[model samples]
Target chain A: FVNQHLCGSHLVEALYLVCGERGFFYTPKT
Target chain B: FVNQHLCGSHLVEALYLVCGERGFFYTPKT
Candidate 1:
């Protein structure tokens, strides 16, 4: 039973930095 | 003007599998 707390928000930040401005930033539908 | 591009190949391989089955497997620009 995974929830929002288990999934770190830092991952999205990291991905944004990883792909630079070309990266896709969107919320997951869960 | 780079042909294959002046990037380190291993970084791609290392970063490639970081997310396990969730990681995107492909190449990028120079």
Candidate 2:
């Protein structure tokens, strides 16, 4: 994916969701 | 050189970052 002009925030507790939806910010749920 | 297809043998994990006017860091698939 180009992923151009994209930006968003994400917490670092559940990092699966950020694996990611256009890098939705995987929270590294370790 | 984020991460995407690849950058001439180098991996390009083209992670989207920043949305401001000066946001040109990711290496395009050129």
Candidate 3:
């Protein structure tokens, strides 16, 4: 309901699909 | 903020924005 995705459930799925174990990092948006 | 609930008198209904009906577009990322 808040900015987070539903609950702790979304973590593994998001990691699998988007992060892929790289530990979610990003450069500053230009 | 009260989790899963309201905060004071503010009724916060979140919104999502998509590409408008005009069609696909891009913005210079700078």
Candidate 4:
């Protein structure tokens, strides 16, 4: 359903932002 | 970081039983 999709997408985006803020962003290893 | 404990929890549960030939259950209806 649309509601589920929206909620899921919002949650996923939130998680991504939260992780990025905490230095979880991907980078090439040295 | 507990890896964002609660966020991951519900996502797993959602993708898990989203298609179990039934509906989802929750409290405090909107």
Task: Tell me, by DockQ, which candidate is best.
Answer: 1
Query: What is candidate 1's lDDT per residue for A1-30, written digit by digit as tens?
Result: 111222465566445434645657656778
> If you score just chain A, what TM-score does every candidate get?
0.42, 0.17, 0.29, 0.39
Residues A1-30, model 4: lDDT tens digits: 143443533543444444532322122122
Please compute DockQ, using alpha carbons, for every candidate against the native two-chain complex. Answer: 0.05, 0.04, 0.02, 0.03
Of candidates 3 and 1, the better by DockQ: 1
Encode model 2's per-residue lDDT on A1-30: one tens digit a residue: 333343333233123223433454343335
Among incorrect, acceptable, medium and high, the docking class of model 1 is incorrect
lDDT of each: 0.45, 0.33, 0.32, 0.36
Winner by TM-score: 1
Q: Please say which candidate is ahead in TM-score: 1 or 3.
A: 1
lDDT tens digits, residue span A1-30, model 3: 223343354444333334444555443345
fnat, candidate 3?
Answer: 0.00
Using DockQ as the measure, name the better of candidate 2 and candidate 3. Answer: 2
Docking class of 4: incorrect
lDDT of candidate 4 vs native? Answer: 0.36
Which parts of model 4 are misplaced by more than 4 Å?
A1-6, A21-30, B1-30
Query: lDDT, candidate 4, residue A5?
Result: 41
* Model 1: CA > 4 A from native: A1-6, B1-30
Q: i-RMS, every candidate?
A: 10.2, 8.9, 11.7, 15.2
Which DockQ value does candidate 4 get? 0.03
The weakest ten consecutive residues by lDDT in model 1 chain A span A1-10
Worst 10 residues of 1 chain B by lDDT: B1-10
Q: Tens digit of lDDT per residue, candidate 2, span B1-30?
A: 122333432222223222334444555555
